[PDB]
Write a protein that binds this DNA or RNA. Structure first.
Ligand SMILES: [Mg+2]
Ligand SMILES: [Mg+2]
Ligand SMILES: [Mg+2]
Ligand SMILES: [Mg+2]
Ligand SMILES: [Mg+2]
Ligand SMILES: [Mg+2]
Length: 191
RNA sequence: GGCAUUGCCGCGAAGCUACCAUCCGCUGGAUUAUGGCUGAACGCCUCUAAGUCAGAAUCCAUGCUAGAACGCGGUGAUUUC
């Protein structure tokens, strides 16, 4: 159809400043600064009233206007990550063998060490992405929490931890052992 | 000592040689399938569309062989008569 114009809104809260050069977005908030390169999408940003950014596609097809809403969501996620932050809670699940998850250093790189997964003798090392903070939650049994400004990095670190613990050569409907994302929310409560 | 078309027999150094002997046979990236992240399309959902992660005896490199006899570089000496 090639819709003449399609646009989405990006509400900017008070403590957030959004600097958008050609398609390099820099969002700054209480928690830090996030940056994204969107030169692959061909959209047009415009600041309306310092609390609203409009992102528009002109003469755009179906896929183009779908990716317009994707761009809106990505900038929203940046703003949410610099205001509220992101936290993914993972639970260790095991029937017999206790999964031993720890934080270790190797050349100063902050790996998450997983030992004894399904009785294995192999040690699974998952690097911690920069900006992602790993805390083990006392008052909840076998809970690891990954927090950070960028949902991309926190969710990908959680997914890496989940995929390092995939069961091979077994019926995974029975052998349910693993480290699974149980909660995905924000750092600041009730925001 | 000769000859017996190496006369025959035992041992036999060297050389050649045998999974019949011994030694040696490298580690990075990108990927496929697949499993994922974020995420619209389609207020939800979604590994997919934009973007993105891991990943095969695969691929391309590292490494190994040849060195273009019309590919190239550095360097030495260049004829007293
Ligand atoms: Mg079986
Ligand atoms: Mg005679
Ligand atoms: Mg004789
Ligand atoms: Mg998801
Ligand atoms: Mg794609
Ligand atoms: Mg030659």
């Amino acid at each position: 159809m090639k819709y003449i114009q399609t646009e989405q809104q990006i509400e900017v809260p008070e403590g957030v400043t959004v600097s958008i050069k050609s398609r390099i977005v820099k969002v700054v908030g209480p928690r830090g600064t996030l940056t994204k390169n969107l030169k692959h999408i061909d959209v047009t940003f415009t600041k309306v009233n310092n609390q609203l950014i409009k992102v528009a596609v002109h003469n755009g097809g179906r896929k183009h206007v779908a990716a317009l809403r994707t761009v809106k969501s990505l900038v929203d996620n940046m703003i949410t990550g610099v205001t509220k932050g992101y936290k993914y809670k993972m639970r260790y699940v095991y029937a017999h063998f206790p999964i031993n998850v720890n934080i270790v250093e190797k050349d100063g790189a902050k790996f998450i060490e997983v030992r004894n997964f399904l009785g294995d003798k192999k040690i699974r090392n998952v690097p911690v992405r920069d900006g992602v903070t790993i805390e083990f939650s006392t008052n909840v049994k076998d809970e690891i929490v990954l927090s950070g400004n960028s949902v991309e990095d926190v969710s990908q670190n959680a997914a890496d931890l989940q995929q390092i613990c995939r069961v091979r050569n077994k019926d995974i409907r029975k052998f349910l052992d693993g480290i699974y994302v149980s909660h995905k929310g924000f750092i600041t409560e009730d925001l």
